[PDB]
Ligand binder design. Structure first.
Ligand SMILES: *[C@@H]1O[C@H](CO)[C@@H](O[C@@H]2O[C@H](CO)[C@@H](O[C@@H]3O[C@H](CO)[C@@H](O)[C@H](O[C@H]4O[C@H](CO)[C@@H](O)[C@H](O)[C@@H]4O)[C@@H]3O)[C@H](O)[C@H]2NC(C)=O)[C@H](O)[C@H]1NC(C)=O
Ligand SMILES: *[C@@H]1O[C@H](CO)[C@@H](O[C@@H]2O[C@H](CO)[C@@H](O)[C@H](O)[C@H]2NC(C)=O)[C@H](O)[C@H]1NC(C)=O
Ligand SMILES: *[C@@H]1O[C@H](CO)[C@@H](O[C@@H]2O[C@H](CO)[C@@H](O)[C@H](O)[C@H]2NC(C)=O)[C@H](O)[C@H]1NC(C)=O
Ligand code: CUO
Ligand code: CUO
Ligand code: CUO
Lengths: 210, 366, 182, 211, 825, 50
């Protein structure tokens, strides 16, 4: 809802989370939600959101984890934004919607879960994939005008493999009431058998797409 | 009427209580006696229905029968007696207790013998008032009974209608909770009369016609297999006249709005105007049927009966005032008229012809 | 019937002019009738004229019984003769005859159906009923085995209170109305 | 309290009432309205209950000075007669201000007839009843509108026929009772067939028991 | 076997059809045979032949001023019809229907010359006039047109013919139909004929004017319409139960088989009883059986609606005199000022057979009496002035002075075809198109900065603006009193109009909160939606209203108890509360119960907030307000239906007659957008919702018909019940009153009641106490009502009133409850 | 069950029929919803959706 009800009668205030205002150009970012986002239905459609991150959580390389994580993270942007131009549906304006950060706290939470799972046994938590891209301070965090020193100092991707020094922690980081050992059980025993995959060669097409 | 909750409240549970005793009867045995399952035997031991209507000892059996039933709610919070509803007083609709659809013990009964709860089909100044008052008018007991029984069964006719499982039939009537409650009233009417007599110095706890029959004992109330001592004690005719040793009381024997003394004045008042009556001979027939009068409408009255009932014939005529009919045609009991009748069976058909013979037509001044 | 009883929906402009002999200060000196001379004043007799009838039942019938009869009467096919009446300067008796055509050739007439009277005097105030007066000829047609569809006509024979000078064609010929049963 | 209309505007006092009060009296207020009927003054204004009439009041303490201001009176209820057998009432023979009972002529008794005869004889002996018959009769007292001609005063062509004679029977009965009549003017029902005319009017002479 | 002739409307005739008609008439006019025009025109009136052609003394032939008038003239038209069909007309006799308002006299009637399009030759138009043979070769019919022919509908007014044609068609008795019908027909004779001697207004020469037969083609058509109506009503269309005596006497001269009438069919069906079945006997049809474009179905509807009104009539008793004349009557009150009533005409000549109507010819003056501000039984008289054709004023002694008769309204259900966009529907039943229509309409209305706008109309309720601005010192809404329902009814009406003004094809929906609901219905609940037509995402206009002078949007803090109040589903508290409201057989008793429940929902959707539905001052700005008030209004409509089902009053109420007369404050004022809400400002007028032009689909509570409602209502009266009474009044703030029954020092919640109010309020005190039965609550605690009268145990009611902004809570300023025992009757 | 709409000839229309027609089209011309005049007009041609 666009309005926040404070416990004190007072006057209603625009709740900050519904719409992020885009100050340059002009406001605002509303969101045309797609039906796919809601899957409380009896059996089908299957939870494809879960299967997405579930597929990334299985991969034991960083590269392979990364491609499968990133793709699995796109459905949220797409389905929440919808046809509207100024929304999460395009990467041009998606950061202006407060739901963006509520969405990415989860995908980062997924990332943590993965490193935990690799750490479970017995594989690297290090990105062995983009070594050259790790040595440059990522713009505009390494920029001279960064408000916070904590991010400017860690602006290099090289120093971002672990997140303990960044001053935060998640309450759970276990998806859908599963032990780290319970999850790995499913993952390892989804690996067992004959399998078949749709193989996609992906790259930038200058637009969001289904 | 006039009940105060929870006075209503206690009873359902009690009626609920006996729905299954179900050992003594518990209620089905208590039901059988008026009902279908066979009460007794001719010495040949053939099935009879131990129903004691159609005879002059008609009230005692029932008035008791309430007792048997009445006792049956015994110390089950049977904190007050079975109520009565005065069908005499004109009424737009039926009475609650037996209407409320949900969580009510008076809606219906069940019948192990048929696997079903009762079904009832109601069918459309107050008619019964006029009809009962006449009965009160009479002074002979026997004369009274014929009208008293016929005024009575008019309701077993109309409450039940066209369901075999119902109040219209002898066979399964006794099964429906509505039946006793109608009774208290019928019994009450009788009591009022006794008070009447007493007022008039005529016999009330006695009765001179016929000496025959009050002495015959009454089954089942006779039967050894009636595990209530009391009824057997008064199983007889002549006992059971003084309902005082029952022991119950009606809240007040006043017909609507009348002291008993008031009542006689009323009847006495009615009696001034000369009247004209028709009287039929009625006699047993297996089926139960309603009869519709004509000359304009003169009707109507009903007879209660079922298969395997003891046959019966009334000693006396049954009278039905038809004076309003004559005025309707402007006749003077002088100009002479054809009294035309009709007689429907309770089942949808079929108005078969007498059967009953011819109606006499008689005049009372005045 | 839930209709107007102490009032009249019908001809209204007549209802407020006071009765001419009673409204006149002379010779009516009874103050009771004088004040309540206007037609609307006298509708509820009881409250105004302080009188009652012992019973308002007709022919021994309570009013509900009455409307019941009346309703049964409407329950059957009935046939009427319509009469347009007006002020002659003399009172007279008009009798009703049902004229039946004979097969060959055309013929008539006389069968006694009914009778009704019109009242009058030489100096009476002139008048004209603005609706037909009805006489049920239904049962008499039944004794002639006649029908509403059957061919017949209705003739009135005007006999005035003279006993003589039997009057001639003062009123329009009797209309024949058929009311089918509801 | 008075009722005022918008028009004149003219008022008429509708009566007064007193409410009892003191300084430390118990806190009290009615959960019900106090009703005063006010029906007479309404009809007196020739004001139907639908036309706009605002209700107005003035309030005084025990001394002369006026108190201001109040009070909610916004309800004016219309109470239909119990008798009209309308929407809200079952059929009931309405109780009326009815003095005299007129009864069937056949139901008369030996005494009630002689009472009626003697009372009317007195009315006939004095010049009265002929004067009443003359309201209806042939000496014409009705010459309107100009008037060309004079007519008999009774109305016979009109729908107000019953009204006129309803008044006639009233006038003769009122004067008859004053002449000491034991009973009101009886109705005799011709609707019931008869071989002869009633006792009262048929025979030319009666036996008078008193004389 | 040829196929029936069709009687077309005049203006519908094609160039081919007009042509064949004009050439055909040209011949039968030149035709000196008895099949000719002069001869057929002889059949009607002046060259008389009717007693029989041999009589010494003769009267005019045609029947007029009698029951068989339509029959005679029906057969008279087919006489003229068969002539010109055999004279080469491809069609039947055309009509010009006066059913439609007239702007002009038809072309083929009015133009003196006619040019054949096919042969290009200009000739004299045969229909312009007719020759009267016997007078002289040089003698023609002439015409004069009264402006009374060209009248057009006014604001409320309708053309003379329209009102009077319906008035005839309304009649159910043939003779009552005939008398009204004929005089309606007489009007054109006077209006086209005028004061000219050889014209349609003269009985003698009328048939010599060719227009006569076009006009009477329509007269015939009207009878067929009336005939069709009677079929629709299940009445005898082809037979007459009245004037049976006349249906045997054969029509002259048609009855003469010998040389005077050559038509085989016309002689054969010379009996008026046989004249009935026109299609089989005389073989002719009409293109359309319509009164001013109305179907016979639409016709009967209009008729039955008019029968529901309280009407009063001027009655006229007509006896016949030669010659023709027209009468004018005025309605005159006791005070000198007289107003013009309507007028009527008779057709006559010197040779006419004497005629007298045996019934009254009725005229409607009900619209005129209302203009004179006096009722039917008030002192008023009718003066009538009748002038002849001649035309000198004919003595008032000639026709008997008029009578006056009021016919009471007939209370019974009607159809009634109501415009699709004006019915109010259950919000959950709405289709996607209705939803989108409403939303687009509401967004525009909220964006509206005019007085028709949302800010302005929302300002009518919670202001600050009651009379007289700027005095207040007052708030302008009506509660709590009987007139509460009324005020919000116009308010909701006022809202509906503004909706339509921005293109709403949907009336305000109602939300049924008596049914169990897990959450707010989506139309009200959803925050925003995606439009396809614009790529934009836009928010639901039903979600919140902006309060302009407070610079805040409305808020909805929904108490979880709102949904909990109706979770019965039939044991739900709300169901019980409403059924108890429906039981009330007094309007004021109904009102308090109604408004208290209305306050309940107001409170629970926007509770514990300023600028919300719960706060009386600002609640109207939240769009769901109207949807809620659609619901309470429907509840009242159900009650009105329940009231009408019982014999009790529905259209009026005997309560606060002081208020019902005076019209309401914010709407009357000259500064009101639409005139329609101004007209109905009076509470007396909005009592019935149908007259306001809307309706609910549909009117039933839960799954029960109205009959079934009263059944369940009676059943609740058949049990004993125990109520707590609340005399309520205006505290300057909204509040919730919690009720607890205490068997001992131990207390449990018995019920709850809500109160609407704000800083700017209109001070209000209720007439009686609102009731709520705690009988089931008592039955739960096993305390049978007898104990209420018992000294021991001791029981009490405790009330804790809480302010709209919690808690606060308030010390007790409302009177304590009362125990009321209602024994079943 | 609702009776069929009648397509009348223009010049045959009565004042009541004309009026209700005028007001209907006036609203649906102002109606910004899809059931409005502008949107329905689109179905034919120029703002293309086919
Ligand atoms: C109200 O009533 C008063 C009386 O109560 C009434 O005045 C009366 O009018 C009549 C009618 O004119 C008068 O009648 C008289 O009657 C005697 C016979 O009883 C005649 O001798 C008189 O004239 C007769 O002869 C005339 C020719 O010579 C005739 O032309 C005439 O018709 C008579 O036959 C005379 O008419 C009567 O005297 C008065 N009485 C009084 C007290 O006024 C008055 O008309 C009524 N007012 C209204 C407005 O109705
Ligand atoms: C009694 O007979 C006489 C004739 O001797 C009737 O008188 C005529 O009646 C006509 C109307 O029918 C009037 O136009 C005449 O003016 C009357 N003349 C006379 C001298 O009276 C009279 O109508 C008859 N009255 C009755 C009751 O029959
Ligand atoms: C105009 O008309 C009236 C009536 O049409 C003429 O007077 C009528 O004359 C006859 C006798 O021939 C009377 O019986 C009628 O009573 C008279 N009229 C009425 C209305 O009743 C009158 O003479 C004519 N005058 C002109 C204009 O020539
Ligand atoms: O005569 Cu005028 O009243 Cu019967
Ligand atoms: O009918 Cu002969 O007059 Cu128009
Ligand atoms: O609006 Cu005035 O209160 Cu619901």
């Amino acid at each position: 809802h666009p309005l926040f009800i404070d416990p004190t009668g007072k006057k209603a205030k625009k709740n900050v989370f519904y719409s992020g205002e885009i100050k340059f150009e002009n406001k605002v970012t509303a969101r045309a939600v797609d039906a796919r986002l809601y899957q409380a239905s009896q059996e089908g459609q299957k939870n494809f959101l879960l299967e997405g991150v579930l597929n990334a959580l299985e991969q034991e390389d960083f590269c392979h984890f990364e491609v499968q994580l990133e793709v699995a993270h796109n459905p949220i942007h797409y389905l929440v934004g919808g046809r509207f131009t100024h929304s999460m549906s395009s990467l041009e304006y998606t950061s202006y919607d407060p739901l963006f950060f509520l969405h990415h706290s989860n995908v980062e939470r997924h990332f943590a879960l993965w490193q935990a799972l690799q750490k479970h046994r017995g594989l690297p938590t290090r990105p062995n994939c983009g070594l050259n891209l790790f040595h440059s301070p990522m713009e505009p965090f390494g920029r001279d005008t960064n408000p916070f020193a904590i991010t400017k100092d860690n602006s290099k991707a090289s120093s971002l493999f672990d997140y303990e020094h960044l001053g935060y922690a998640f309450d759970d980081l276990s998806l859908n009431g599963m032990t780290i050992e319970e999850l790995e059980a499913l993952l390892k025993q989804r690996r067992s058998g004959a399998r078949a995959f749709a193989n996609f060669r992906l790259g930038g097409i200058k637009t969001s797409a289904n | 009427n006039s009940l105060t909750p929870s006075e209503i409240e206690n009873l359902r549970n009690a009626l609920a209580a006996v729905q299954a005793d179900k050992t003594d009867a518990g209620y089905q045995k208590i039901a059988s006696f008026h009902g279908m399952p066979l009460s007794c035997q001719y010495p040949d031991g053939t099935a009879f229905a131990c129903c004691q209507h159609g005879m002059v000892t008609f009230p005692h059996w029932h008035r008791l029968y309430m007792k048997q039933m009445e006792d049956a709610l015994k110390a089950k919070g049977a904190k007050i007696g079975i109520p009565y509803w005065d069908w005499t007083t004109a009424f737009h609709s039926l009475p609650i207790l037996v209407t409320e659809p949900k969580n009510n013990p008076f809606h219906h009964g069940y019948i192990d013998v048929a696997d079903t709860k009762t079904t009832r089909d109601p069918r459309p100044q107050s008619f019964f008032y006029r009809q009962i008052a006449f009965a009160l008018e009479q002074r002979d007991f026997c004369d009274f009974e014929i009208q008293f029984e016929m005024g009575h069964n008019a309701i077993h006719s109309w409450v039940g209608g066209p369901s075999p499982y119902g109040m219209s039939t002898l066979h399964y009537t006794s099964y429906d909770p509505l039946f006793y409650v109608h009774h208290s009233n019928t019994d009450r009417i009788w009591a009022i009369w006794q008070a009447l007599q007493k007022y008039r110095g005529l016999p009330y706890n006695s009765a001179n016609c016929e000496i025959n029959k009050l002495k015959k004992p009454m089954m089942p109330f006779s039967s050894e297999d009636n595990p209530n001592e009391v009824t057997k004690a008064h199983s007889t005719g002549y006992k059971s006249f003084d309902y005082q040793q029952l022991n119950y009381e009606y809240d007040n024997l006043n017909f609507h709005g009348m002291t008993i003394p008031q009542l006689e004045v009323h009847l006495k008042k009615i009696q001034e105007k000369d009247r004209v009556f028709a009287g039929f001979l009625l006699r047993a027939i297996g089926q139960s049927a309603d009869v519709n009068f004509d000359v304009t409408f003169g009707g109507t009255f009903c007879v209660l009966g079922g298969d395997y009932e003891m046959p019966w014939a009334f000693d006396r005529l049954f009278l039905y005032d038809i004076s309003k009919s004559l005025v309707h045609l402007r006749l003077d009991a002088h100009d002479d008229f054809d009294i035309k009748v009709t007689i429907m069976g309770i089942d949808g058909k079929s108005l078969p012809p007498n059967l009953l013979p011819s109606p006499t037509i008689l005049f009372k001044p005045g | 019937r839930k209709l107007s009883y102490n009032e009249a929906n019908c001809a209204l402009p007549l209802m407020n002019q006071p009765m001419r002999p009673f409204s006149n200060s002379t010779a009516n000196n009874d103050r009771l009738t004088f004040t309540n001379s206007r037609p609307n004043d006298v509708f509820d007799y009881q409250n105004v004229l302080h009188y009652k009838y012992d019973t308002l039942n007709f022919a021994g019938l309570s009013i509900p019984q009455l409307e019941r009869i009346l309703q049964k009467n409407q329950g059957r096919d009935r046939i009427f003769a319509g009469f347009l009446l007006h002020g002659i300067k003399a009172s007279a008796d008009v009798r009703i005859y049902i004229c039946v055509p004979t097969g060959i050739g055309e013929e008539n007439c006389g069968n006694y159906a009914g009778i009704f009277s019109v009242l009058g005097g030489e100096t009476e105030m002139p008048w004209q009923f603005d609706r037909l007066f009805r006489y049920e000829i239904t049962d008499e047609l039944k004794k002639l085995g006649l029908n509403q569809n059957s061919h017949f006509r209705v003739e009135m024979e005007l006999t005035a209170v003279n006993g003589s000078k039997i009057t001639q064609k003062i009123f329009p010929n009797p209309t024949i109305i058929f009311v089918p049963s509801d | 309290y008075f009722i005022a209309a918008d028009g004149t505007d003219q008022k008429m006092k509708a009566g007064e009432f007193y409410v009892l009060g003191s300084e430390n009296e118990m806190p009290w207020k009615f959960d019900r309205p106090y009703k005063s009927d006010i029906t007479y003054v309404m009809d007196a204004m020739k004001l139907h209950y639908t036309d706009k009439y605002h209700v107005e009041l003035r309030i005084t303490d025990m001394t002369g000075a006026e108190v201001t201001d109040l009070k909610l009176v916004t309800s004016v209820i219309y109470e239909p007669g119990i008798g009209n057998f309308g929407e809200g009432r079952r059929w009931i023979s309405p109780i009326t201000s009815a003095s005299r009972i007129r009864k069937n002529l056949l139901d008369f008794e030996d005494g009630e007839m002689e009472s009626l005869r003697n009372a009317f004889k007195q009315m006939a002996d004095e010049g009265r009843y002929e004067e009443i018959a003359s309201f209806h009769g042939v000496p014409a007292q009705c010459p309107s509108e100009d008037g060309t001609m004079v007519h008999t005063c009774c109305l016979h062509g009109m729908p107000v026929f019953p009204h006129w004679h309803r008044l006639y029977v009233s006038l003769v009965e009122d004067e008859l009772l004053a002449r000491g009549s034991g009973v009101a003017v009886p109705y005799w029902d011709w609707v019931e067939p008869f071989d002869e005319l009633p006792r009262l009017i048929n025979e030319a002479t009666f036996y008078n028991s008193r004389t | 076997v040829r196929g029936n002739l069709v009687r077309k409307n005049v203006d519908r005739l094609s160039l081919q059809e007009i042509n064949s008609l004009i050439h055909a008439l040209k011949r039968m006019q030149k035709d000196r045979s008895s099949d000719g025009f002069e001869t057929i025109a002889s059949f009607h009136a002046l060259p008389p032949l009717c007693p029989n052609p041999t009589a010494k003394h003769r009267h005019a032939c045609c029947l007029h001023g009698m029951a068989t008038f339509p029959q005679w003239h029906r057969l008279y038209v087919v006489q003229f019809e068969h002539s010109l069909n055999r004279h080469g007309a491809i069609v039947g006799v055309p009509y010009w229907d006066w059913t439609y308002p007239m702007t002009e006299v038809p072309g083929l009637l009015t133009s003196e010359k006619y040019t054949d399009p096919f042969t290009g030759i200009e000739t004299f138009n045969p229909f312009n006039h007719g020759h009267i043979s016997f007078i002289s070769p040089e003698t023609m019919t002439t015409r004069e047109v009264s402006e009374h022919l060209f009248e057009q509908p006014a604001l409320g007014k309708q053309t003379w013919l329209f009102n009077n044609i319906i008035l005839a068609l309304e009649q159910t008795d043939y003779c009552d139909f005939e008398v009204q019908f004929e005089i309606v027909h007489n009007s054109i004779h006077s209006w086209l004929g005028g004061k000219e001697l050889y014209s349609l207004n003269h009985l003698h020469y009328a048939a010599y004017d060719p227009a006569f037969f076009l006009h009477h083609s329509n007269v015939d058509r009207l009878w067929v319409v009336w005939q069709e109506l009677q079929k629709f009503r299940g009445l005898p269309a082809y037979e007459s139960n009245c004037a049976i005596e006349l249906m045997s006497q054969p029509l002259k001269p048609f009855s003469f088989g010998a040389p005077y009438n050559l038509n085989p069919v016309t002689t054969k069906y010379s009996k008026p009883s046989d004249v009935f079945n026109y299609k089989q006997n005389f073989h002719y049809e009409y293109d359309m059986l319509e009164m001013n474009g109305m179907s016979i179905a639409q016709l009967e509807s209009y008729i039955r609606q008019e029968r529901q009104k309280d009407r009063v009539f001027a009655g006229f008793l007509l006896e016949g005199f030669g010659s023709s004349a027209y009468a004018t009557f005025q309605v005159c009150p006791d005070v000198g000022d007289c107003y013009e009533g309507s007028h009527f005409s008779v057709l006559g000549g010197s040779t006419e057979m004497p005629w007298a109507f045996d019934r009254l010819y009725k005229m409607e003056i009900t619209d005129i009496l209302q203009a004179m501000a006096l009722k039917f039984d008030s002192h008023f008289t009718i003066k009538t002035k009748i002038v002849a054709h001649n035309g000198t004023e004919l003595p008032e002694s000639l026709l008997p002075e008029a009578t006056i008769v009021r016919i009471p309204p007939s209370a019974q259900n009607l159809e009634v075809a109501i415009p699709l966009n004006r019915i109010r529907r259950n919000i959950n039943s709405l289709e996607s198109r209705d939803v989108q229509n409403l939303m687009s309409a509401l967004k525009r209305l909220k964006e509206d900065e005019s007085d028709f706008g949302f800010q302005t109309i929302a300002g009518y309720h919670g202001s600050l603006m009651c009379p007289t601005p700027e005095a207040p010192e007052y708030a302008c809404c009506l509660h709590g009193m009987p007139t509460f329902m009324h005020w919000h009814r116009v308010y909701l009406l006022h809202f509906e109009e503004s909706m339509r003004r921005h293109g709403a094809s949907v009336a305000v929906p109602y939300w049924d909160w008596t049914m169990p609901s897990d959450n707010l219905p989506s139309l009200l609940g959803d925050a925003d939606y995606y439009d396809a037509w614009t790529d934009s995402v836009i928010e639901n206009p039903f979600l919140r209203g902006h309060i302009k002078y407070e610079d805040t949007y409305t808020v909805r803090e929904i108490q979880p108890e709102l949904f909990a109040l109706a979770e019965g589903q039939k044991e739900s508290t709300l169901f019980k509360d409403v059924m108890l409201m429906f039981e009330q057989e007094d309007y004021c008793d109904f009102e308090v119960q109604a408004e208290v429940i209305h306050n309940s929902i107001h409170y629970l959707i926007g509770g514990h907030q300023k600028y919300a539905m719960s706060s009386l001052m600002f609640s109207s700005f939240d769009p769901i307000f109207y949807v809620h008030h659609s619901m309470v209004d429907r509840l009242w409509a159900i009650w009105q239906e329940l009231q009408k089902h019982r014999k009790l009053p529905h259209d009026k109420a005997y309560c606060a007659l002081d208020q019902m007369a005076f019209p309401m404050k914010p709407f009357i004022w000259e500064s009101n957008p639409n005139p329609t809400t101004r007209a109905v400002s009076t509470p007396s007028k909005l009592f019935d919702y149908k007259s306001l032009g809307y309706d609910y689909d549909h009117l039933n509570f839960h799954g029960m018909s109205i009959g079934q409602l009263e059944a369940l209502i009676q059943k609740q009266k058949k049990a004993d019940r125990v109520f707590a009474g609340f005399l309520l009044h205006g505290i300057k703030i909204s509040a919730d009153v919690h009720l607890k029954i205490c068997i001992e020092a131990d207390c449990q919640e018995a019920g709850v009641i809500f109160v609407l109010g704000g800083e700017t309020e209109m001070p209000w005190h209720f007439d009686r106490n609102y009731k709520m039965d705690i009988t089931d609550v008592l039955k739960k605690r096993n305390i049978p009502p007898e104990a209420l009268f018992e000294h021991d145990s001791k029981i009490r009611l405790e009330v804790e009133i809480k302010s709209v902004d919690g808690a606060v809570l308030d010390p007790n300023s409302l009177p304590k409850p009362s125990l009321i025992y209602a024994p079943a009757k």
